[PDB]
């Protein structure tokens with residue numbers, strides 16, 4: 014129940030077993046549904062695009078992110094400057110806790126506003142054209158104003174809740190990759206990334222700051238960088254680069270600018286800002302609130318899955334639209350040269366409306382009308398019967414209908430259907446890989462199924478990835494001195510980021526087969 | 531036992547098949563009021579015919595996604611309606627007579643109804659059903675409007691529905707094939723693969739017809755149930771008590787007679 018159990022390859026080059034105590038708060042936070050969702054997404058992503066060389070690195074990074082998320086959740090968990098500060102922290106924690114409820118409230122308010130907008134009417138006469146609500150009850154007119162104000166307020170609170178809930182994870186991440194690239198790869202000491210890496214060029218503003226890591230746990234990254242690289246690349250120059258006084262060892266507007274520049278490049282933060290912008294524009298023109306109905310795609314998981322079929326082959330869809338444009342252009346260049354007389358779109362005999370006397374006009378006519386026509390341009394241009402170019406015209410029309418109407422639209426249909434099939438196959442492959450192999454050691458279930466429920470026992474008690482995450486958290490919370498021998502071994506080996514204590518291809522059973530038998 | 535009878539009747543009235551038969555009876559009674567109520571019984575072909583059930587399983591497998599994509603269609607058409615009601619109101623005159631206009635987009639509700647009803651059923655979208663935009667200042671905006679409507683609504687979303695149905699067909703076929711393959715390649719009781727039993731000729735067939743027959747296990751359970759407690763032999767009484775405690779460890783998991791006595795059978 015409270016007892017954790019992990020297996021590592023120890024200093025003796027043998028698989029061992031480590032027992033430790035798991036906190037109930039940590040267990041509850043791990044079983045929390047959003048953490049479970051993050052774990053499922055991580056598993057799916059690594060199984061799709063991951064290799065054994067980087068699998069453990071990605072796993073440890075995911076564990077670190079999860080631990081920081083647990084810290085944030087515990088921080089925001091609910092239990093004249095002083096009263097102002099306590100009220101402010103209470104309010105900010107409330108918004109962080111209720112971010113998702115506020116998002117759903119914004120969606121509901123958008124639906125309510127647009128349902129009210131279904132009652133607008135335009136008239137020349139006042140209630141120049143005026144827009145007004147025509148409904149019997151008379152409550153929709155003030156309800157719309159109240160709901161628009163409430164929706165703007167909810168969007169603002171959603172931005173604040175995001176800033177207080179999900180920005181810290183982004184900052185912690187970016188700080189941790191910057192620290193790792195600086196102290197392992199020497200990205201700025203030796204590599205000096207060019208102007209192409211906009212992230213690397215922007216990250217220069219934080220290296221010399223008083224607190225380069227503020228969300229990242231490793232607060233000794235500057236010391237580590239100094240020790241590792243200064244002795245070879247100039248101790249004084251390294252200290253100048255990192256903005257640390259060497260003499261201070263014996264005895265933040267710039268960082269705020271860096272953090273804000275990082276936040277303003279966040280996709281989710283930018284989406285929430287656009288949501289706020291259209292909420293503000295709704296008070297200028299209420300119909301701008303219709304742009305918030307696009308939030309259903311962002312919100313609903315089923316809608317996201319359905320639209321993933323469209324976006325999976327989005328590049329091929331754009332390419333086939335361009336191919337359609339080119340093919341229709343070729344039909345237009347043939348028409349403008351040989352079939353100009355058939356493009357009269359005027360019933361009146363007095364004034365012609367030739368739609369193919371101009372190349373631009375003929376191309377526009379073709380793209381607009383012949384692609385939306387069921388049988389192609391032959392429905393929309395003059396009948397070719399009783400003419401010298403009749404067979405040429407029927408070949409033209411039939412090839413247009415085949416290549417454009419049938420073949421290219423079939424290509425689009427098949428792209429969408431193949432996207433459906435490919436996504437389904439990806440999900441099935443991830444599920445099969447998880448069912449038939451162990452995440453940590455990669456040993457198949459055929460070996461563990463020698464005993465009844467052997468694979469279940471192995472993946473629930475011996476090599477539980479949740480157990481490994483719990484062990485990492487336990488090491489982090491534990492003090493350095495209190496470490497046992499195995500704990501200190503794995504702690505130092507993790508601080509060096511060597512993922513060889515994770516048992517690769519070996520397990521306790523595969524080691525002591527004879528002695529367990 | 532009136533209370534038990536009430537409980538049983540409340541259980542029966544929540545049975546799906548019993549409720550379906552009750553509805554069948556209700557429409558049969560309503561047929562004598564209006565004979566055309568007997569047409570509601572033609573829906574019974576879906577309930578009855580296995581082929582029809584299999585065919586409609588393709589529609590119902592992705593039913594949630596079909597409902598969601600219909601809702602997405604409604605939202606997208608609403609967005610096209612909010613654009614039309616603001617910028618293209620003059621093109622929605624559906625009256626041939628010049629004297630009396632029939633503007634279909636002077637009301638937001640009317641324009642949304644027009645869009646959903648007509649532009650989704652039109653082959654090329656709303657551009658077939660509204661006024662031609664040629665010779666107008668908003669001509670390029672109107673052609674972009676019409677072409678995006680035809681692409682996103684007529685092509686993309688109907689393609690999504692088509693693909694949902696086709697993928698349901700494929701997924702159901704794959705499920706049937708996977709079940710058949712699992713039964714062919716593994717034993718139901720012990721889970722040992724056919725590759726091990728195929729050491730001897732027809733070894734897997736012998737194992738699944740004589741050694742670990744699930745029908746045989748069911749027959750043994752029935753035989754124990756019919757047999758009296760006293761008449762049980764030692765093994766019969768052991769398995770009987772262990773079943774009464776509902777411990778399913780007497781079912782051989784991962785082991786068989788051959789895998790046990792390989793040397794002594796050889």
Ligand SMILES: Nc1ncnc2c1ncn2[C@@H]1O[C@@H]2COP(=O)(O)O[C@H]2[C@H]1O
Pocket residue numbers: 447448450451452453472473476477478479
């Ligand atoms: N190291 C692992 N830890 C947990 N689950 C694993 C591991 N390796 C494979 N799995 C499988 O992944 C499944 C995810 O959760 P389940 O409870 O379905 O059971 C799990 C196992 O079948």
Ligand SMILES: Nc1ncnc2c1ncn2[C@@H]1O[C@@H]2COP(=O)(O)O[C@H]2[C@H]1O
Pocket residue numbers: 713714716717718719738739742743744745
């Ligand atoms: N324990 C089992 N009992 C019966 N059939 C099994 C068992 N395990 C696997 N099978 C397979 O399932 C098939 C169902 O009926 P068949 O006569 O086709 O042959 C059977 C075997 O191939």
Ligand SMILES: [Zn+2]
Pocket residue numbers: 451452453454455456471475476520
């Ligand atoms: Zn394992």
Ligand SMILES: [Zn+2]
Pocket residue numbers: 717718719720721722737741742786
């Ligand atoms: Zn068997």
